[PDB]
């Protein structure tokens, strides 16, 4: 009937889980700066078609508690995959393998889940963030800084306290509205002191997919938690690069479908389109099926194009 919420002890956290439906499990993993709630439309669509949809708030987000906000080292990709493995052990006890659907930093987590524990995943649908072949020369923060400079969001998120202080006088609702409705293919810039002024606005009609009630759901949660938990994922990127050196040259061996919006800023990182479409991606992910690009859509595809995303998930997982 209705979406059920519970709290589950996992990997030192008290994790909030939302759940709908009965049948084979699909784990949904949200992105930045989002919540379990970003999957609202898919949960309904797949539950109606005989699956059990489960979507947690990740470490540092929403109603999930226990991670120390003052130590970004506890938001490493090893901690995060640890969370997910523990979650699956707690909530999918009689399914050796489950389906995984993920978006943005959720997809970053999912790629590493499949590297570390392919035995847990039956098939994967990842949105927005393609596999990143580890660059042995430098970490991702340094790479993106070399391209886009110091005001690039990844660079600005690095120093603890700074982006939090930038957002404080603006309020969570304005920050989330600006990010959620963003449509330009350039990365976000947060120059010191300029608030949201360096972020262009699209015509209002292009965000009619986001109701005021939906926006308020996010704004209310983030008013309470703040942004430190979410931003700490980016502060951990340098250590993530060091910690993942053992998987140089390793392939993801799980059957995979990848989907991205035409206007997604990640899709416009220099080299990404080449990697995705011209063979590199398929080499790292040998069971990657045909890549899907959603024409006229931007980053938040699960909410902007819910039917297309829901159906793409259903059609993929039905093959198994």
Automatic annotation (TrEMBL):
Respond yes or no to whether keyword Hydrolase is given for this record: yes
**Which GO MF terms does the UniProt record name?**
epoxide hydrolase activity
Write out the catalysed reaction.
an epoxide + H2O = an ethanediol; (24S)-24,25-epoxycucurbitadienol + H2O = (24R)-24,25-dihydroxycucurbitadienol
Hydrolase as UniProt keyword: yes
UniProt xrefs under Pfam families:
Abhydrolase_1
Q: Which residues form the AB hydrolase-1 domain?
A: 24-129
- Identify the pathway: Secondary metabolite biosynthesis; terpenoid biosynthesis
Q: Which superkingdom is the protein from?
A: Eukaryota
Under Enzyme Commission nomenclature, its number is: 3.3.2.10
InterPro entries for the chain = AB_hydrolase_1, AB_hydrolase_fold, Epox_hydrolase-like
Q: What UniProt keywords are attached to this protein's entry? A: Hydrolase
Q: What job does the chain carry out?
A: Epoxide hydrolase involved in the biosynthesis of cucurbitacin and mogroside tetracyclic triterpene natural products (e.g. siamenoside I and mogrosides IV, V and VI). Cucurbitacins have cytotoxic properties and exhibit deterrent taste as a defense barrier against herbivores. Mogrosides are nonsugar highly oxygenated compounds used as high-intensity zero-calorie sweeteners; they also possess pharmacological properties such as regulating immunity, lowering blood sugar and lipid levels, protecting the liver, and acting as antioxidants and antitumor agents.
Q: Which family does it belong to?
A: Belongs to the AB hydrolase superfamily. Epoxide hydrolase family.
Xref: PANTHER family: EPOXIDE HYDROLASE
Q: What is this protein called?
A: soluble epoxide hydrolase
